Symmetry: D3
Subunit: 158 residues, 6 copies
C-alpha cells in the first residue's frame, strides 16, 4: 500500500497542477494547449525521491476522478517507461486498494488492464506536449509489479 496525493484528476480538462514542495501549495503549472485530458488520476508518493530529485510519480487508474490534493491508497501493478527532454521518466501504474474499491481486486498486473486504456495512456503521453514549445516524450516500454515495487523502495530509501 502506497499513499498517492493526486495533482490532476482523470478526464479533468486543460489544467495541469503541480504541488510546490517548498510550500505545499498547488500551483498551476500549465494551461494545456491540446484537446487532451489526463487519462488517469495523476500524482505522487509523498516522502520519496526519484533519482531526478523529485518524488515518485504515479498514475492511479480508478473509475472516477478525485479532487486535486486528495490522497488515494493504492497498490502498484506496473510501471510506464518514458524518456522526455529532461531524459528518462518512469511513472508507476497503481490502482485503488480493495478497501477503497473492491472492483480492482482482480487487477494484479498490467496484463489485467484494458488494452485500450493502456494505449490511451501511451497516446496521451506521447502527444500532450505536442503544442508545447521545447518539450516532448517517448514511451520506451513497461515494467511489471516487481519492477514497480523496487522503484518505490529505492525512492523511499533515497
Amino acid at each position: 500500500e502506497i499513499n498517492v496525493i493526486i495533482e490532476i484528476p482523470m478526464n479533468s480538462g486543460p489544467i495541469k497542477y503541480e504541488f510546490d514542495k517548498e510550500s505545499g501549495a498547488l500551483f498551476v503549472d500549465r494551461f494545456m494547449q491540446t484537446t487532451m485530458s489526463y487519462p488517469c488520476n495523476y500524482g505522487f508518493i509523498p516522502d520519496t525521491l526519484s533519482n531526478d530529485g523529485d518524488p515518485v510519480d504515479v498514475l492511479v487508474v480508478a473509475h472516477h476522478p478525485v479532487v486535486p490534493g486528495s490522497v488515494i491508497k493504492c497498490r502498484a501493478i506496473g510501471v510506464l517507461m518514458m524518456e522526455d527532454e529532461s531524459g528518462l521518466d518512469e511513472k508507476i501504474i497503481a490502482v485503488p486498494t480493495s478497501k477503497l474499491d473492491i472492483t480492482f481486486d482482480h487487477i494484479k498486473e498490467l496484463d489485467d488492464l484494458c488494452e485500450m486504456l493502456k494505449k490511451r495512456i501511451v497516446h496521451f503521453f506521447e502527444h500532450y506536449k505536442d503544442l508545447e514549445k521545447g518539450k516532448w516524450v517517448k514511451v520506451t516500454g513497461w515494467g511489471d509489479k516487481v519492477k514497480a515495487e523496487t522503484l518505490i523502495k529505492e525512492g523511499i530509501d533515497r
Copy 2:
C-alpha cells in the same frame, strides 16, 4: 479552527459535497490530509454537504459530524459557518451514531433564516436523508445502518457541548 464562532454558531469543515457522486472523502485527523475513504458502490450521492466540527470529540473518538443542509454544494475542505437545528440518530453494526443537522447562518444565506427547527425542513428532504443513510452501505459487506430517530436543537447543542468539553 474552533468548534464555535459567534452567536452560538459552529464551524463545520466539509468532507463531502452534496450530490457529488461516488467519492467519499474523509480528513485524516492526524495529518490533516483529505483522504479518499471509499469509492462508493451504489448509485447514491450524499443528500447534504457533510463534514465535522473541528476541535470536538465524540465517544467514537472522532469529531462531531454534521450534515449541512444548503442549496448548493461546496468544495471539499471548505468551511461553512452554521446553526445547529437538530440531530439524526442512528445505529450501525458497530454501535450508536448521531449526526448534527445544521443550516448555514443567515449571513452566509439569509434564506435559511426561518429554519429554526427540524420541523421546518422539507419533508421529502428529511426522508431522502434517512433513505440515504439506511441504504448507502448496502453493497458493503457487513455494514448496516438504521435510523432510530431524531433529536431537537437542544439535543444538538448538548452533543456539541459534550463534544467540545470532551476534547
Copy 3:
C-alpha cells in the same frame, strides 16, 4: 428507426443517461416529445444508459426497454447501436417487467467486444443495477420493485424477436 442494426444488433433510443441526476425522462411515442416523467426524490442516479427499441411492442403495450451498459453517458434522445447480452427480470406494483441488458456494438466501442453474456459484466455493477431498481421508487407512494432474476442472451433475443413480431 428500425429495431435492428445488423443480424444480432439493436437500435436503442436513450431516454435517461447513466449517472445523470434526478430527472427521469420518458419519450412520448405519440408526439415523439421527450417528457419529464418525474424529478426523482432519492439520491439515486441511473446506473447506466436507459432506453427502448424503436419499432417494437411489448406485451405491456410499451416498447421493449433496455439498459445499455456503457463507459459514458449519452444525451437523451440519442441512439446507440447495441447487442443484447441478457435480461433483468423484475416485478413491480403493476406486475411483471423485464429489461434487456445490452452493450455497444464493437464498431462503437471495441472495449466491449469480449463481453457476450451477463457473466462477463462486473459483478458489482450488476449488484449496483439491482440495488437501484429495488430502491429508486422507495419514496414514491404505492410504488415498489423486486428483482426476481436474470435471463440470458437467448432469452433476450427472443424478447426482442417477439416485440418486433408484435
Copy 4:
C-alpha cells in the same frame, strides 16, 4: 388545468440562449449571452398557444433542478411576471411542476408562496441580463394573479 411547456433554457445553464424555431421545430442559438448571469428558472413556452406579439405564451418554470433543452415539463401556473422592454410589454407565466412530477411543490399555490429571495433573483436577472446588448433593456412593472395567468393562457390557446 395543467400545461405542457417545452423548455428552451434550463435553469442555471451557461450563456446559451436557445430559441425554438417554430417553422422547422429546431432549437436555434438566439444568443451567446454577454453577461455573467444564468437563467434563474427553466424557461420556454406552451405549444399551440399564441400571444398578442404573435409569439407562443412563454413560461418560467420554478423547479429544483434543470432539464435538458427541448424537453417538456407538465406544470401548473401560479402567477405572471409583468415587464416592459425596449419594445413594449412582456409578460411571463410563472409555473411550478405538477405534483405528479414533483410532490414537493404541492403546497405552492400562489406567488406569495415562493421564496422572496427567488422572486428577487428572478426580477434582477431579467432587469439585468440584457444590459450588455446595445439598445436593449427590461424593467419589471409587477406581478400577476393565478387567474391572470389562466386568462393569459386561455387567451393564447384561443388566439391560436
Copy 5:
C-alpha cells in the same frame, strides 16, 4: 427539421446543425439525415475532444454524398441538435484513408456574438487554436485501426463560399 431548415440564413450566412460540442467528452454524434435521429457514431478512444462545435449545413451535398461540414469556432459548447447561424471564413483541408476531406471554418454572426465581429479571415483566429484544431484532426483517429488523417492546408473565405454554393447546387 433537417428538411425544414435552409442552408443559407441569407447572403452572408449559413445555418449549421451541431452534432458534436466543443470540449465535450468522448461521444462522437452523427445525425442520420434519413430519420433526423442523432446516432452515436463512436465512443472515441483517445483523451481528445473536439476543439470546436462540429456539425453540417442542412440542404447541402458534398461530393461524397454527405452534407457540407462545419467547425463552428465559438466561445462555448452548444447542445447537440441545436443550430447556429454563422458566416464562413475559411476551410480546413485534409486527407483521410477514404480520400479527401474539407471542412468549413465558420464563426457565429455578430447578432449571436458580437465578439466575433472582427474575425474575418483565418489569419484573425488565434494561432494556437488553429494548431489545436490541426492537432486534433491529426490524432483523434490514432487508436482506430486503419484510420488516419493528414492536413493538407487551409482555404480562404472565397474557397469556403465556393464550397457552400457547390454543395447547395449539388
Copy 6:
C-alpha cells in the same frame, strides 16, 4: 507563505473563486489558512474571472492585494496562478474605496496571453462584463453597493503591488 513575486515582474496569485463557478463566494482565512464559505450569493451571476489575491501583501484596508486573473479556464480554489499585472479596476463600495488588479497568466502558463500587455488589449465585452459583474453582484444584499470609477494602467497596478508588498 508563498512569495508575492515569482520574480521581478510576475506575481503569485492564490485563487479563491474560479471564473464562472456558481454562487459560492469563498474567502481564505489568513489566521487559519482555511478556505471559508463567505456567502451563498443570491443573484444568478458568476465571477467573470478567476479571483483571489497576492500573498504577503497588505493594502490600506488591512487586507491583501486582490486580483482578477483573466484566463481561459477556471482553476480550483486554493490553487496558485503565476501572472503578470496589466491594469487596475478602480471602484468604490459602501465601505469606501477599492482596487482590483487585473492580471493574466505568464507566458510559461499560457502563451496565448503573450500579446496582452495593457487593458486595451483585452476584449472590450470582457471588460464590460467585469464592470457589470461588480456593479450588480451585491444588489440583493441590503446596504451593499459598488461603483466602478475607472481603470488604471500597468504602472499604476505595479505601484499598488509594490506598496502592498512594502506595507506587509
